[PDB]
Amino acid sequence: NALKSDFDSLRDQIEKAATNAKFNGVSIADGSTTKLTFLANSDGSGFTVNAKTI
Amino acid sequence: KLQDSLDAGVGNLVDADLAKESAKLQSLQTKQQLGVQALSIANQSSSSILSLF
DSSP, rough: OHHHHHHHHHHHHHHHHHHHHTTTOOOSSSSSSSEEEEETTTTEEEEEEEEOOO | OHHHHHHOOOOOOOOOOOOHHHHHHHHHHHHHHHHHHHHHHHHHGGGGHHHHO
């Protein structure tokens, strides 16, 4: 039971660390969106960064 | 660690690169002085009229 409580505390900490990784209201690692495209050139072509849910 | 990364990101957005700004200052000083001499030359254009009379 003690090892079980340790394991559950560790996974709850993982949920906290994963959910709180935001910047300017967006996150690439929490699974909220599929991808984040950023401007790459003057014509509006983007720079894709696929999301990696952790 | 999260507050550190957030402050570093806010600094990455707002902070200026001071070396480029020092170069821009060194350019603008000379540009302002050349403009002052250009206006000083422009002020004298009417002087030729006195020779006419």
